[PDB]
Amino acid sequence: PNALNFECETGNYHTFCPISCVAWLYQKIEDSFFLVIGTKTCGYFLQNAMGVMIFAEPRYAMAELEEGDISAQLNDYEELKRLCLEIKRDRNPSVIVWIGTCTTEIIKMDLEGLAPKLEAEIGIPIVVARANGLDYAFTQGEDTVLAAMAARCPTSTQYHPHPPLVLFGSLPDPVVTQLTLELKKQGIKVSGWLPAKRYTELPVIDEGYYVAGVNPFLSRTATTLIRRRKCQLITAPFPIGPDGTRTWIEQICATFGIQPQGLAEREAETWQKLSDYLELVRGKSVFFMGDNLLEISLARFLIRCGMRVLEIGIPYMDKRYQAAELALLSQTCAEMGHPLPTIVEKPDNYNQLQRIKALQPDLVITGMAHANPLEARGISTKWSVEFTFAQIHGFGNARDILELVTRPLRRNQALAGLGWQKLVA
Amino acid sequence: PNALNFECETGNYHTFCPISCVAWLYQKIEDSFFLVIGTKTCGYFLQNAMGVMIFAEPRYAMAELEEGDISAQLNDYEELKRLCLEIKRDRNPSVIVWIGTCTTEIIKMDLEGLAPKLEAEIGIPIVVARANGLDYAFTQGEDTVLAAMAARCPTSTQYHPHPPLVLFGSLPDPVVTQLTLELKKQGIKVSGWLPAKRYTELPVIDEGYYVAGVNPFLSRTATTLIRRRKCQLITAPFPIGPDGTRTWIEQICATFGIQPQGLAEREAETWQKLSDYLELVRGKSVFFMGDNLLEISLARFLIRCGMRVLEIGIPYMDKRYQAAELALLSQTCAEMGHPLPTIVEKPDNYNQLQRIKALQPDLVITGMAHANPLEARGISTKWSVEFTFAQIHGFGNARDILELVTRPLRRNQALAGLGWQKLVA
Amino acid sequence: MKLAYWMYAGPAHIGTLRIASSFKNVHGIMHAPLGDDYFNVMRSMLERERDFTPVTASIVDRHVLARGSQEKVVDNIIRKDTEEHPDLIVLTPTCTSSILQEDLQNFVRRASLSTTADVLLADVNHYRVNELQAADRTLEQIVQFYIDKARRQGTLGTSKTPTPSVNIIGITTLGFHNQHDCRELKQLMADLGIQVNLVIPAAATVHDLQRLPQAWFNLVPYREIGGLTAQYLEREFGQPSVRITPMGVVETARCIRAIQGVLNAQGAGVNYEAFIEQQTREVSQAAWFSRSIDCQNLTGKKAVVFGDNTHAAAMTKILSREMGIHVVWAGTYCKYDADWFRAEVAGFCDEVLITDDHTVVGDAIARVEPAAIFGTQMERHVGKRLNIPCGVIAAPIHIQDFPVGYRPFLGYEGTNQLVDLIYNSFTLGMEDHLLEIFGG
Amino acid sequence: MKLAYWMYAGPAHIGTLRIASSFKNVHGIMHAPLGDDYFNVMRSMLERERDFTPVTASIVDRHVLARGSQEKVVDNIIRKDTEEHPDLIVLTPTCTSSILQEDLQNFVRRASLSTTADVLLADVNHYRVNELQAADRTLEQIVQFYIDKARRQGTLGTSKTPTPSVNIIGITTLGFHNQHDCRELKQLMADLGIQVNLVIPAAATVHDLQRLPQAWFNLVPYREIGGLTAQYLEREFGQPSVRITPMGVVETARCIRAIQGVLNAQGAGVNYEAFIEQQTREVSQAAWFSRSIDCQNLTGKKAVVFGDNTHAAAMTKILSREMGIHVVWAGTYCKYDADWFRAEVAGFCDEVLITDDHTVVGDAIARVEPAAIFGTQMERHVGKRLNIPCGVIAAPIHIQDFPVGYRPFLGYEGTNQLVDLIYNSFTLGMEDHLLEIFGG
Ligand code: SF4
Ligand code: SF4
């Protein structure tokens, strides 16, 4: 009867530049090539953030700008031509994706303008995604790539009647199969997915189709599907956790006027198989320093699991796009008699470390910048990025989420009775 | 006009137990299996001496004797049966070779008697080779295996006329090909080789055939071919070095009444390609502590190369078998105006270290037991065992011999002008 | 515009941060968009740091293009001043800071009026220098600044210590085996009877700096960081320096002889020669290794070497001069200091490779087919693709390249470590070739 | 009769030779056929020894079966006496010596009448003991003998040192990282304020032995060698012993507490507790590693451990108790001391494996599919066949397992080395799985 509380801080926090989306998206779109137009600053980030994948001949490179590029002593269109040609020679990609960068913004480089021209001359589709640290955080990178992709989707030219549904959000193939085959049990067809395995497989999207988000950070992509493609958006909580997954399905079926057949049981069965992780998770506190936009829906899951969430930090909050996920959180807070947590947008990591110090939470969810300094101070931590690449969607993956959240809890058990938890310099 | 001098010491010296011959012979006879009947003492030697090959699932194992075997509380024939059967199950070999050992001698185990019986019961040939430290040194192991093999060789049942020639001595296939094709240029057929690639390929050997040794330690095998098989032995120097190789061929051809066509040139060409190793080797002194029976023929090669040999140490000297090789040495000493060296049979390593200390040779050829202690004393050393497994036979391999002998000489060059050569504890 | 995905040396700002992070109570603040703070991730991961990395970002968002990026910078400086109370705060230009061209020098002038902390702007420019040059300059800049404060306040301790003593200059955070090199260096000084006056950047306090001129001389172990500072102290104080990286047996001996000359020149009356003999025979095993049959088996074997100036030049001379190895080519990615490299390695390899393109290095490994590679993590990965062992000798390094086991590269124990590293890479590849040759 | 080709522990004579080779001026002479002298090859290769190995063979040839093997033995003893002038010569029975059954005890009785050197026959029997038990016994035998000489000559120094002091017993030639463990142990004693009275076998002289009772107590770092000797000194002198292998953080702390009790029991008045806190936080990084995110990523990962009693038991407790690893099974090849092992590891692995058959160990690795293996060279080779990383923790070791770089396993620096060894094996296998998962 008193609702969630939303706050907003300085935006001074740690998170991965959105250009990181090249790392999983090139892995996802098999015939793509991601060219990031940027500096050595950007190159250094990706070389280090993508760890071992940088030694797997990735389909990614920096177009590293010289001083001559900044002053226009070198012609930008000519520069892009010479090296987009190198790419076509050595990789024969089916799409080149340009990642616009802070530098390209500040010096105003008309990528959106140069692309359609260069495309024609060269034979290859060029997709521009202005995914920079000026404007966006981490997983928001994928949102700016997928919005841009949505414009490239072709047009029109046992299941129930329902109109074409197309889902959007890059996920590992095993998790597509699992989710697609989850709706197949309800008699819902997945006409396609926005990013498919190959750029050449982008789904048809005609005026009248339905779309649904599978990840919380896909605002722009959703906005685009509605406005530019003319689709109906099923707003629903995201299938992260078994509560998430069932609500997600129930809401799809409801949009289509279907009674969800046989899944109260499918949920309980999933929860039952988590008895041992729930014993550990029960009663303990969590603190989400925000960084990847999964936080509203992980918090909501972890409250149903029996945890106390002390703060939900978030880079950016789309109340329109998350709407249903936010409704499920508040309702979950009521059903578990948990006081409504506060959602901190654009948080101040510094301040947050003071709050953590005051609260002594059992679990801080956070970046590698703060984890070891925290552990050394006796605060247990779980590094947040792993949530973005572990499989966490659908019924079969609720275990995975908990393996993640309990990991530091298990290491605590295994190492108990050895007085050195708080050992700083 | 005054000949070689032969001496004989205490037999107190380092060398590899003859059971080491399993290591290269199992590698050579592809379908064989070598069972060494011995103790943990023997096992420890082989496990360590065969270095990396012990991790390649060798076709070799110890039949390790218990206290019950020594006292005959366990029946030897029954013991051998149970485990020769294990071997047949897991490897399906075409011959099992028993290596008699010191222990088997001292406790008088009738391997030669038990073998023909066990063979019949089990379906597989069993070859006994009494190759022990009581009686033999290092490469003499192969001689005792090959003598035993000679008894198993089947009987009768463009080239020149000549009667069947069969060569004996295990060599790497590439060196067989090279030597066989060396005689093929003289119009000499190699009817077979005693050890072939497979036990199933042992050559025919009928009364009247000719045989020739390719390695200096094959006495017993030669004696056997003459006496038990009824063959004519071409005594000749061994084709180690290009002088060796030409003499070896000249002597084969001579036995058959053939003029060796076009090889004065083939020799000079080989020598010319060794200019750079000969510059290094010229004038320097060598000391062979004996250990593998190659020593008479390496010394002879190295004297023609321009070195001063100060001592030829040898485990065992068969003047009958080496005869021609010994004749070539003395003649080589005369042609190079080198005083006839003395050949020390059954040397005393201790005494030898006193002589080395007195002589300060440029090169001591020797075992790993003495090498590092010598180096640390400023004496350069070449480890002798490498001569047994490097390819050193024929024209194409004279380079290999020199790479070996000069190696410590080259390291001397590369490390000159750094005052620490004599740095003992 | 160049197409690349790998770089051996990072953006300029990395060097300034590494300098700021090596002192105590020095806080770097970076004028940069959201996300350029990955330096903190790297510090905390690779060095497994128990303390927060004292580097904050004055954020550049769009509201910056509009006279932004010049008001938060003052606010963020003062806020950092009050929350963390540093001795020194260092404003840190990035690639973005570079193309907005705002009067950063001014904010620093302004901000230092409202802060207890001293304030500097790193005299460093993205488009002209890399990580290493930036770090070299920043370290000089801070020394000079605090030398200057001492002078104008009358506190400049200007009298040399009674007994010979030294400043060790250039030990750095995220520096390849630096913490261990530092311990190895203090131990050597102690064995030589030389008091250690001060160790800089690493763990030094800004207030110590004025004691610098009290050293009889300065030792600079790494080619790439500290040269600038050693030179300034020479011209201001007549403070001589020894810049011979004691890395390997022959070079360690040089370093120590040089120290000998420089101290006797000011009256020390010291001969180290017996110390060098005794360490070379007794403490280092490397001389003995060179004579041993193990090393004899390596003569003439082919290697390639690639890394930074210090380690690739020292490695190249250890391979050739101390172990009889055939170094087909040795190279460095320190292009801006290429001439020094070519001179250091002349007569120790057949060919010199100067590049910072990993694909040129890779192709040069495939064409030569060495028996072993000594290089960076990227050369290690080429070795894996080509089935060739690799010993890692220089940065771009991973967590396994920050051991907690004692692994200096410098000094007499450092010689012991290099033997193992070298013998192990050669022997791993031989043992592999033999396995396959025999069975599997 | 058993069929095998691999053995974890060598013939009995190896232990006696290792004991003889660890003292100075002690010459082992082996009653053995030509070829049993491979021990010298092994010593010289693995330890890269600058000195000849003081082990000779009184040869057994056929002329021995004929009352041989009992006349050269006297001649060879005296000749060795005069050429090398040892303090002690040790006659050494082999497997051959074992089945000829000659009065060796007699020749020793005879030979010692004609030699300046003392003479013993190793009280060791091929068919009853292995390398390790033999070495344990031989070391006791020599201590007792020279304790006895001291007594009968009146030179037995029987008064305890003024300040607490210790005998370090069990450091051996060809012992896994023994030379480094020894240095690590003397350093710990020195930091604890404990004089080191004597270190035995390694580098000790037989004439020192009589000073043994002057120690307040004895430290025995390895389960397998020195127990016998520590026990004899307890019963003869009331000399207490601490037999807790300081290997790992928790066990190092135990060892040091035990030393604390034993010394205060004789009036030392010492508390080490602040020393343990200070080393555990500051010098060892292992406690900090356990809390770090690096270690957190290992929780629940599966390992298997196999080796000798000391290292496999210590490794097993480091993995479980200090790093949250799941040790599916831990095993040892010291069958004759299996009960000690089972007790040491109870509650630290799911299952205990006692065997000395490498194929049983191999099959037990394949069935469990751990993420990492800690074992001998043979377990390392199983890892290669199965694509699983392996850290080598115990003998059958190769040259790469005798580093000249400082690598103790014991003590506080030893904890640092074990972290790297462990984190590196886990991370190498993860990084490999990821490479393949991504491309190649
Ligand atoms: S924030 Fe901008 S400058 Fe920094 S890495 Fe990201 S794109 Fe490049
Ligand atoms: S000499 Fe005899 S006892 Fe020794 S290893 Fe050889 S066979 Fe076995």
CSV table of N, CA, C and O in Angstrom, one decimal, chain D residues 253-310:
chain,number,residue,atom,x,y,z
D,253,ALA,N,51.4,-22.9,11.4
D,253,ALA,CA,51.0,-22.4,12.7
D,253,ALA,C,51.0,-23.5,13.8
D,253,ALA,O,51.3,-23.2,14.9
D,254,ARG,N,50.6,-24.7,13.4
D,254,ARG,CA,50.7,-25.8,14.4
D,254,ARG,C,52.1,-26.1,14.9
D,254,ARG,O,52.4,-26.1,16.1
D,255,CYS,N,53.0,-26.2,13.9
D,255,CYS,CA,54.4,-26.6,14.1
D,255,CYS,C,54.9,-25.6,15.1
D,255,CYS,O,55.6,-25.9,16.1
D,256,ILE,N,54.6,-24.3,14.9
D,256,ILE,CA,55.2,-23.3,15.6
D,256,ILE,C,54.7,-23.2,17.0
D,256,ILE,O,55.4,-22.8,18.0
D,257,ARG,N,53.4,-23.6,17.2
D,257,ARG,CA,52.8,-23.6,18.5
D,257,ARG,C,53.4,-24.8,19.4
D,257,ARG,O,53.6,-24.6,20.6
D,258,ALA,N,53.5,-25.9,18.7
D,258,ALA,CA,54.2,-27.1,19.3
D,258,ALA,C,55.6,-26.7,19.9
D,258,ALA,O,56.0,-27.0,21.0
D,259,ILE,N,56.4,-26.1,19.0
D,259,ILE,CA,57.8,-25.6,19.4
D,259,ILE,C,57.6,-24.7,20.6
D,259,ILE,O,58.3,-24.9,21.6
D,260,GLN,N,56.6,-23.8,20.6
D,260,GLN,CA,56.3,-23.0,21.7
D,260,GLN,C,56.1,-23.8,23.0
D,260,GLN,O,56.7,-23.4,24.1
D,261,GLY,N,55.3,-24.8,23.0
D,261,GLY,CA,55.0,-25.6,24.2
D,261,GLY,C,56.2,-26.3,24.7
D,261,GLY,O,56.6,-26.3,25.9
D,262,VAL,N,57.0,-27.0,23.8
D,262,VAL,CA,58.2,-27.8,24.1
D,262,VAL,C,59.3,-27.0,24.8
D,262,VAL,O,60.1,-27.5,25.5
D,263,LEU,N,59.4,-25.7,24.5
D,263,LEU,CA,60.5,-24.8,24.9
D,263,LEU,C,60.1,-24.2,26.2
D,263,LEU,O,60.9,-24.2,27.2
D,264,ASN,N,58.9,-23.6,26.3
D,264,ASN,CA,58.3,-23.1,27.6
D,264,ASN,C,58.3,-24.2,28.7
D,264,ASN,O,58.4,-23.9,29.9
D,265,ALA,N,58.2,-25.5,28.2
D,265,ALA,CA,58.2,-26.6,29.2
D,265,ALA,C,59.6,-26.8,29.8
D,265,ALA,O,59.7,-27.4,30.8
D,266,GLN,N,60.6,-26.2,29.1
D,266,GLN,CA,62.0,-26.3,29.7
D,266,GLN,C,62.4,-24.9,30.1
D,266,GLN,O,63.6,-24.6,30.2
D,267,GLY,N,61.5,-23.9,30.1
D,267,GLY,CA,61.7,-22.6,30.7
D,267,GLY,C,62.0,-21.5,29.8
D,267,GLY,O,62.4,-20.4,30.3
D,268,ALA,N,61.8,-21.7,28.5
D,268,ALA,CA,62.1,-20.6,27.5
D,268,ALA,C,61.4,-19.3,27.7
D,268,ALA,O,62.0,-18.2,27.5
D,269,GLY,N,60.2,-19.3,28.3
D,269,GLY,CA,59.4,-18.1,28.5
D,269,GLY,C,58.9,-17.4,27.2
D,269,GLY,O,59.0,-16.1,27.2
D,270,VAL,N,58.5,-18.1,26.2
D,270,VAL,CA,58.3,-17.6,24.8
D,270,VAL,C,56.9,-17.7,24.3
D,270,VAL,O,56.3,-18.8,24.2
D,271,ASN,N,56.3,-16.6,23.8
D,271,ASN,CA,55.1,-16.6,23.1
D,271,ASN,C,55.3,-16.2,21.6
D,271,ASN,O,55.9,-15.2,21.4
D,272,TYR,N,55.0,-17.1,20.7
D,272,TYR,CA,55.1,-16.9,19.2
D,272,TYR,C,53.9,-16.3,18.6
D,272,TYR,O,53.9,-15.9,17.4
D,273,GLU,N,52.8,-16.2,19.3
D,273,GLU,CA,51.5,-15.9,18.8
D,273,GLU,C,51.5,-14.6,17.9
D,273,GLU,O,50.8,-14.6,16.9
D,274,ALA,N,52.3,-13.6,18.3
D,274,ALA,CA,52.3,-12.4,17.5
D,274,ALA,C,53.1,-12.6,16.3
D,274,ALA,O,52.9,-12.0,15.2
D,275,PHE,N,54.1,-13.5,16.3
D,275,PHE,CA,54.8,-13.9,15.2
D,275,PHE,C,54.0,-14.6,14.1
D,275,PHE,O,54.1,-14.3,12.9
D,276,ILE,N,53.2,-15.5,14.6
D,276,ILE,CA,52.3,-16.2,13.7
D,276,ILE,C,51.3,-15.2,13.0
D,276,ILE,O,51.0,-15.3,11.8
D,277,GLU,N,50.7,-14.3,13.8
D,277,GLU,CA,49.7,-13.4,13.2
D,277,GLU,C,50.5,-12.6,12.2
D,277,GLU,O,50.0,-12.4,11.0
D,278,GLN,N,51.6,-12.0,12.5
D,278,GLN,CA,52.3,-11.1,11.6
D,278,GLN,C,52.8,-11.8,10.3
D,278,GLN,O,52.6,-11.2,9.3
D,279,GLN,N,53.3,-13.0,10.4
D,279,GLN,CA,53.7,-13.7,9.2
D,279,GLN,C,52.5,-14.1,8.4
D,279,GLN,O,52.6,-14.2,7.1
D,280,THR,N,51.4,-14.4,9.0
D,280,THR,CA,50.2,-15.0,8.3
D,280,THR,C,49.5,-13.9,7.5
D,280,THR,O,49.0,-14.2,6.4
D,281,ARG,N,49.5,-12.7,8.0
D,281,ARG,CA,48.9,-11.5,7.3
D,281,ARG,C,49.9,-10.9,6.4
D,281,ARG,O,49.5,-10.5,5.3
D,282,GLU,N,51.1,-10.7,6.8
D,282,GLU,CA,52.2,-9.9,6.0
D,282,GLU,C,53.1,-10.8,5.1
D,282,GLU,O,53.4,-10.4,4.0
D,283,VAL,N,53.6,-11.9,5.5
D,283,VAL,CA,54.6,-12.7,4.7
D,283,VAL,C,54.0,-13.7,3.8
D,283,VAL,O,54.2,-13.7,2.7
D,284,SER,N,53.2,-14.6,4.4
D,284,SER,CA,52.3,-15.5,3.6
D,284,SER,C,51.2,-14.6,2.9
D,284,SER,O,50.6,-13.8,3.6
D,285,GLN,N,50.9,-15.0,1.7
D,285,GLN,CA,49.8,-14.4,1.0
D,285,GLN,C,48.6,-15.4,0.9
D,285,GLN,O,47.6,-15.2,0.4
D,286,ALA,N,48.9,-16.6,1.5
D,286,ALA,CA,47.9,-17.7,1.3
D,286,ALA,C,46.6,-17.4,2.1
D,286,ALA,O,45.5,-17.7,1.6
D,287,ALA,N,46.6,-16.8,3.3
D,287,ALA,CA,45.4,-16.5,4.0
D,287,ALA,C,44.7,-15.5,3.1
D,287,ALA,O,43.4,-15.7,2.9
D,288,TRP,N,45.3,-14.5,2.7
D,288,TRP,CA,44.7,-13.5,1.8
D,288,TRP,C,44.1,-14.2,0.5
D,288,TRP,O,42.9,-14.0,0.2
D,289,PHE,N,44.9,-15.1,-0.1
D,289,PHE,CA,44.4,-15.8,-1.3
D,289,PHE,C,43.1,-16.5,-1.1
D,289,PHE,O,42.2,-16.4,-1.9
D,290,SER,N,42.9,-17.1,0.1
D,290,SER,CA,41.7,-17.9,0.5
D,290,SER,C,40.5,-17.0,0.5
D,290,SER,O,39.4,-17.5,0.3
D,291,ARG,N,40.6,-15.7,0.7
D,291,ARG,CA,39.5,-14.8,0.8
D,291,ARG,C,39.2,-14.2,-0.5
D,291,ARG,O,38.0,-13.7,-0.8
D,292,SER,N,40.1,-14.2,-1.4
D,292,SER,CA,40.1,-13.4,-2.7
D,292,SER,C,39.2,-14.0,-3.7
D,292,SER,O,38.8,-15.2,-3.6
D,293,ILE,N,38.8,-13.3,-4.8
D,293,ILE,CA,37.8,-13.8,-5.7
D,293,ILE,C,38.4,-15.0,-6.5
D,293,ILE,O,37.6,-15.8,-7.1
D,294,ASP,N,39.7,-15.0,-6.6
D,294,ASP,CA,40.4,-16.0,-7.4
D,294,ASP,C,40.2,-17.4,-6.8
D,294,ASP,O,39.8,-18.3,-7.5
D,295,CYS,N,40.3,-17.5,-5.5
D,295,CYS,CA,40.1,-18.7,-4.7
D,295,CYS,C,38.6,-19.0,-4.7
D,295,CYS,O,38.2,-20.1,-4.9
D,296,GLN,N,37.8,-17.9,-4.6
D,296,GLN,CA,36.3,-18.2,-4.6
D,296,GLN,C,35.9,-18.9,-5.9
D,296,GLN,O,35.0,-19.7,-5.8
D,297,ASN,N,36.5,-18.6,-7.0
D,297,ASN,CA,36.1,-19.3,-8.2
D,297,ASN,C,36.5,-20.8,-8.1
D,297,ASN,O,35.8,-21.5,-8.9
D,298,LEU,N,37.4,-21.2,-7.3
D,298,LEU,CA,37.7,-22.6,-7.1
D,298,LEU,C,36.8,-23.5,-6.3
D,298,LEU,O,36.8,-24.7,-6.4
D,299,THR,N,36.0,-22.9,-5.4
D,299,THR,CA,35.2,-23.6,-4.4
D,299,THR,C,34.4,-24.7,-5.1
D,299,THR,O,33.7,-24.5,-6.1
D,300,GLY,N,34.5,-25.9,-4.6
D,300,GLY,CA,33.8,-27.0,-5.1
D,300,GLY,C,34.4,-27.7,-6.3
D,300,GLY,O,33.8,-28.7,-6.8
D,301,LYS,N,35.5,-27.2,-6.8
D,301,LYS,CA,36.1,-27.8,-8.0
D,301,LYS,C,36.8,-29.0,-7.5
D,301,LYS,O,37.2,-29.1,-6.3
D,302,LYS,N,36.8,-30.0,-8.3
D,302,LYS,CA,37.3,-31.3,-8.0
D,302,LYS,C,38.8,-31.5,-8.2
D,302,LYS,O,39.4,-31.2,-9.2
D,303,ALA,N,39.5,-32.1,-7.2
D,303,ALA,CA,40.9,-32.5,-7.3
D,303,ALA,C,41.2,-33.9,-6.8
D,303,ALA,O,40.4,-34.4,-6.0
D,304,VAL,N,42.3,-34.5,-7.3
D,304,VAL,CA,42.8,-35.7,-6.7
D,304,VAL,C,44.2,-35.5,-6.3
D,304,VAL,O,44.8,-34.6,-7.0
D,305,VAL,N,44.7,-36.2,-5.3
D,305,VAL,CA,46.0,-36.0,-4.8
D,305,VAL,C,46.7,-37.3,-4.5
D,305,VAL,O,46.1,-38.2,-4.0
D,306,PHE,N,47.9,-37.4,-4.9
D,306,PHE,CA,48.6,-38.6,-4.8
D,306,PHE,C,50.1,-38.3,-4.7
D,306,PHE,O,50.6,-37.5,-5.3
D,307,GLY,N,50.7,-39.0,-3.7
D,307,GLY,CA,52.1,-38.8,-3.5
D,307,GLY,C,52.7,-39.5,-2.3
D,307,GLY,O,52.2,-40.6,-2.0
D,308,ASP,N,53.7,-39.0,-1.7
D,308,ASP,CA,54.2,-39.6,-0.5
D,308,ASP,C,53.3,-39.1,0.7
D,308,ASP,O,52.5,-38.3,0.6
D,309,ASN,N,53.6,-39.7,1.9
D,309,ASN,CA,52.8,-39.3,3.0
D,309,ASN,C,52.8,-37.9,3.4
D,309,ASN,O,51.8,-37.2,3.5
D,310,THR,N,54.0,-37.3,3.5
D,310,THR,CA,54.1,-35.9,3.8
D,310,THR,C,53.4,-34.9,2.9
D,310,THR,O,52.7,-34.1,3.3
